[PDB]
Structure 1
Amino acid sequence: MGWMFKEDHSLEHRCVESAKIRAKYPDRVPVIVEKVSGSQIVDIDKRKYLVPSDITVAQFMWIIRKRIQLPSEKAIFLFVDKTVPQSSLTMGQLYEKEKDEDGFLYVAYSGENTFG
């Protein structure tokens, strides 16, 4: 699809917000979550999700599905940099290793297993 944030304003915003977030919440990682177009799942608002570096991918994933209230009838899958992250990996580790030029993380979700 494309990055809505990157189209509108990212570099300046991400720089200032990263400084504020690192200063106030040094133990948290700044993530952006978007709904992949075409799947049957509910849509997501434009929000800046700040998760503690202590939790694992398993907990973060479970929170995204619980927040959007994913029923047992549908499935939910996550994607980061075109890869399937390991649920047991730590938020801080995945953040530091995948740390972008703007020091933020981009995660997309789908409610289908085959995106085509």
Structure 2
Amino acid sequence: MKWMFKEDHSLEHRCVESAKIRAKYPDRVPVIVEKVSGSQIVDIDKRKYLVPSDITVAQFMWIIRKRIQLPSEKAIFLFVDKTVPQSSLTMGQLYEKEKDEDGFLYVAYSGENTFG
């Protein structure tokens, strides 16, 4: 995926921003959230998240679902890098496993791969 956050900020800028935020909040996970490019699902208003390291991926998934008010019947999927994060991991664990070199964790989301 090609992230708008990276298109909007240079590596230098992002590297420093995450360094500042993490130093300030050592027990929180800084996450950049964007909808999969071209996906049909509605976009999201908030892109930057700073969550306690203990919440699970499943709980983070709920935060995103709530943010876009996606109906229970409609499925939502979280993507990190080239795979799907295991819902049981804590965001702190996902951060250590998948953090970008810039210090942020990048999570993409999408809905159902409906047709025409």
TM-score by length of 2: 0.86
Check 1:8–1:65 CA distance in 2 against 1; reply closer, same or farther (3 A cut): same
Confirm or deny: 8 A CA contact 1:56 1:87 kept in the other structure: yes
Shift of 1:115: 9.3
Confirm or deny: 8 A CA contact 2:34 2:47 kept in the other structure: no
Confirm or deny: 8 A CA contact 2:31 2:106 kept in the other structure: yes
| Partner-residue secondary structure (3-state), 1:101 | coil
| Partner-residue secondary structure (3-state), 2:107 | strand
Check 1:14–1:7 CA distance in 2 against 1; reply closer, same or farther (3 A cut): same
Confirm or deny: 8 A CA contact 1:77 1:113 kept in the other structure: no
TM-score by length of 1: 0.86
Shift of 1:92: 0.8
- Cα offsets for 1:63-116 (capped at 9, x unmatched): 110111111242111111111111111111110121221111111111114799
Q: Distance in 1 between matches of 2:94 and 2:115?
A: 24
Aligned Cα RMSD in Å?
2.2
Check 1:104–1:98 CA distance in 2 against 1; reply closer, same or farther (3 A cut): same
Q: Distance in 2 between matches of 1:90 and 1:51?
A: 10
Moved more, 105-114 or 56-65: 105-114
Moved more, 6-15 or 27-36: 6-15
Shift of 1:21: 1.0
Aligned residues: 116
Shift of 1:33: 0.7
Which sections of structure 1, spanning at least 5 residues, go unmatched? none
Confirm or deny: 8 A CA contact 1:39 1:115 kept in the other structure: no
Q: Runs (4+) of structure 1 moved beyond 4 Å?
A: 113-116
Check 1:29–1:97 CA distance in 2 against 1; reply closer, same or farther (3 A cut): same
% identical aligned pairs: 99
Alignment correspondent of 1:54: 54
Confirm or deny: 8 A CA contact 2:53 2:91 kept in the other structure: yes
Which sections of structure 2, spanning at least 5 residues, go unmatched? none
